[PDB]
Amino acid sequence: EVHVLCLGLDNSGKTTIINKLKPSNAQSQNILPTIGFSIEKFKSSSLSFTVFDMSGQGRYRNLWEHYYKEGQAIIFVIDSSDRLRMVVAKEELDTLLNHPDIKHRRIPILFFANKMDLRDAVTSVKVSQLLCLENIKDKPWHICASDAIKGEGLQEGVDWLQDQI
Numbered sequence: 001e002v003h004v005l006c007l008g009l010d011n012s013g014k015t016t017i018i019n020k021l022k023p024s025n026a027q028s029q030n031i032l033p034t035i036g037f038s039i040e041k042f043k044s045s046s047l048s049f050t051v052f053d054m055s056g057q058g059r060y061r062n063l064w065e066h067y068y069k070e071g072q073a074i075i076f077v078i079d080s081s082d083r084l085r086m087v088v089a090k091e092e093l094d095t096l097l098n099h100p101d102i103k104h105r106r107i108p109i110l111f112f113a114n115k116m117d118l119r120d121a122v123t124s125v126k127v128s129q130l131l132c133l134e135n136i137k138d139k140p141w142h143i144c145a146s147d148a149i150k151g152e153g154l155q156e157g158v159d160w161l162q163d164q165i
């Protein structure tokens with residue numbers, strides 16, 4: 001019953017995170033850059049998900065807005081270890097948030113400050129400061145640190161998302 005858009009730059013960990021939310025039997029073992037986008041399903045405590053897992057490469061970011069009218073929730077993923085590319089991420093977040101099909105809907109945004117395990121990684125608090133998430137006033141949001149390979153942090157996000165729905 002719940003349609004989610006998974007957005008963020010390429011190499012942020014989007015497909016790794018979505019994969020980890022799946023039952024063990026359903027999980028992919030070799031995750032490659034997404035070609036355009038994919039549609040996945042996962043399940044939480046009592047919620048069934050359809051996820052538009054978009055490629056975040058520059059080549060395919062044009063596709064995102066085509067699917068905005070069926071984001072009932074957004075999962076936006078940040079590579080915590082890459083401050084330089086985080087400037088590009090913030091630009092895209094700001095465009096997303098101001099888009100005609102997004103700006104007037106109270107849609108919940110879950111952020112993941114992913115790749116928390118890497119030495120250069122910024123904390124979820126620091127990410128929230130850097131992206132200026134405090135400025136999001138008309139939508140519910142939450143941010144988590146995550147290590148998507150291990151699965152650390154994903155439970156809290158999914159739990160927050162489920163509450164919002």
Ligand SMILES: Nc1nc2c(ncn2[C@@H]2O[C@H](COP(=O)(O)OP(=O)(O)OP(=O)(O)O)[C@@H](O)[C@H]2O)c(=O)[nH]1
Pocket residue numbers: 008009010011012013014015016017031032033034035054055056057114115116117118146147148149
């Ligand atoms: N160390 C570490 N590596 C991660 C983490 N999450 C994802 N990765 C790795 O980062 C690379 C990119 O992960 P993907 O899930 O393919 O990234 P993406 O956002 O889906 O990229 P696109 O589909 O190209 O937009 C892969 O090699 C993953 O194994 C993490 O939390 N920690």
Ligand SMILES: [Mg+2]
Pocket residue numbers: 014015016032033034053054055
């Ligand atoms: Mg991907």
